[PDB]
Design an enzyme around this catalytic site. Structure first.
Site, mmCIF file in Angstrom:
data_model
loop_
_atom_site.group_PDB
_atom_site.id
_atom_site.type_symbol
_atom_site.label_atom_id
_atom_site.label_comp_id
_atom_site.label_asym_id
_atom_site.label_seq_id
_atom_site.Cartn_x
_atom_site.Cartn_y
_atom_site.Cartn_z
ATOM 1 N N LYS A 1 0.546 -10.427 -10.008
ATOM 2 C CA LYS A 1 0.343 -11.055 -8.714
ATOM 3 C C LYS A 1 0.224 -12.594 -8.832
ATOM 4 O O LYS A 1 0.023 -13.104 -9.935
ATOM 5 C CB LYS A 1 -0.871 -10.460 -8.031
ATOM 6 C CG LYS A 1 -0.717 -9.037 -7.646
ATOM 7 C CD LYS A 1 -2.024 -8.486 -7.099
ATOM 8 C CE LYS A 1 -1.819 -7.113 -6.609
ATOM 9 N NZ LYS A 1 -3.079 -6.528 -6.081
ATOM 10 N N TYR B 1 3.929 -3.355 1.324
ATOM 11 C CA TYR B 1 2.571 -3.027 1.701
ATOM 12 C C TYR B 1 2.515 -2.399 3.108
ATOM 13 O O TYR B 1 1.555 -2.594 3.843
ATOM 14 C CB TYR B 1 1.676 -4.273 1.589
ATOM 15 C CG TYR B 1 1.248 -4.682 0.177
ATOM 16 C CD1 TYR B 1 0.733 -3.750 -0.719
ATOM 17 C CD2 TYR B 1 1.295 -6.018 -0.230
ATOM 18 C CE1 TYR B 1 0.304 -4.125 -1.998
ATOM 19 C CE2 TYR B 1 0.863 -6.408 -1.502
ATOM 20 C CZ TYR B 1 0.369 -5.460 -2.375
ATOM 21 O OH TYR B 1 -0.068 -5.814 -3.627
HETATM 22 O O1 LIG Z 1 -10.840 -3.230 0.011
HETATM 23 C C1 LIG Z 1 -9.754 -3.655 -0.391
HETATM 24 C C2 LIG Z 1 -8.800 -2.778 -0.906
HETATM 25 C C3 LIG Z 1 -7.601 -3.289 -1.390
HETATM 26 N N1 LIG Z 1 -7.303 -4.634 -1.291
HETATM 27 C C4 LIG Z 1 -6.004 -5.169 -1.786
HETATM 28 O O2 LIG Z 1 -4.911 -4.307 -1.501
HETATM 29 C C5 LIG Z 1 -4.259 -3.878 -2.678
HETATM 30 C C6 LIG Z 1 -3.889 -2.412 -2.541
HETATM 31 O O3 LIG Z 1 -5.084 -1.678 -2.608
HETATM 32 P P1 LIG Z 1 -5.112 -0.203 -3.258
HETATM 33 O O4 LIG Z 1 -6.487 0.295 -3.463
HETATM 34 O O5 LIG Z 1 -4.418 0.699 -2.310
HETATM 35 O O6 LIG Z 1 -4.216 -0.218 -4.625
HETATM 36 P P2 LIG Z 1 -4.524 -0.826 -6.105
HETATM 37 O O7 LIG Z 1 -4.555 -2.311 -6.018
HETATM 38 O O8 LIG Z 1 -5.764 -0.319 -6.735
HETATM 39 O O9 LIG Z 1 -3.391 -0.482 -7.011
HETATM 40 C C7 LIG Z 1 -5.252 -4.129 -3.807
HETATM 41 O O10 LIG Z 1 -4.633 -4.383 -5.052
HETATM 42 C C8 LIG Z 1 -6.101 -5.281 -3.298
HETATM 43 O O11 LIG Z 1 -5.653 -6.549 -3.726
HETATM 44 C C9 LIG Z 1 -8.260 -5.516 -0.785
HETATM 45 O O12 LIG Z 1 -8.045 -6.736 -0.729
HETATM 46 N N2 LIG Z 1 -9.478 -5.016 -0.332
#
Ligand SMILES: O=c1ccn([C@@H]2O[C@H](COP(=O)(O)OP(=O)(O)O)[C@@H](O)[C@H]2O)c(=O)[nH]1
Ligand SMILES: [Mg+2]
Length: 149
Positions: free
Chosen positions: A9, A49
């Site tokens: 990222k 997303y």
């Molecule tokens: O409470 C949250 C949950 C997720 N995210 C962001 O959204 C992305 C997707 O979240 P998710 O839990 O679905 O997937 P992961 O990142 O664990 O692969 C994450 O990587 C975070 O950067 C966030 O900012 N706040």
């Protein structure tokens, strides 16, 4: 062989951690098979997303993922999807295991270094979205015979 989509990222890119992150992926035995540094267009960010579309962290996610370049990867290995999630660590870098990428490198959930597909399903979807077939190489590696039976 199983493939997953990984993405370094903009936080990792702006922190100069691209090499460190690739190292941890590589040393685990996962094979880098697609890789490109890119600025993320709006169209691609929103569709990538899509599933988070209504949620509180949305608008921010989109401007964050478009704010600097990412390093998009396709990675190959037995059980690649779950293996990658295991070395990436929990979403929240405060809960992520020490020794995982997020556990060692990230500080907050919104800025957590790296993305990995959460399933076979989303792996296939994400791979097709970010990569065309001709950007994805296949090749045997010397260590392949020493990673598997
Ligand atoms: O409470 C949250 C949950 C997720 N995210 C962001 O959204 C992305 C997707 O979240 P998710 O839990 O679905 O997937 P992961 O990142 O664990 O692969 C994450 O990587 C975070 O950067 C966030 O900012 N706040
Ligand atoms: Mg996760």
């Amino acid at each position: 062989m199983e493939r997953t989509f990984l993405m370094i990222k903009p936080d990792a890119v702006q922190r100069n951690l691209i090499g460190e992150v690739i190292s941890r992926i590589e040393r685990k035995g996962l094979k880098l098979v697609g890789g490109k540094l890119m600025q993320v267009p709006m169209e691609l960010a929103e569709t990538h997303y899509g599933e988070h579309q209504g949620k509180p962290f949305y608008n921010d996610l989109i401007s964050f993922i478009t704010s600097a370049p990412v390093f998009a990867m396709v990675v190959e290995g037995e059980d690649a999807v779950n293996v990658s999630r295991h070395i990436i660590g929990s979403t929240n870098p405060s809960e992520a295991s020490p020794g995982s990428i997020r556990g060692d490198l990230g500080l907050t959930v919104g800025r957590n270094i790296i993305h990995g597909s959460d399933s076979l399903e989303s792996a296939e979807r994400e791979i097709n979205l970010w990569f065309n077939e001709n950007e994805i190489t296949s090749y045997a590696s010397p260590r392949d015979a020493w990673l598997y039976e």
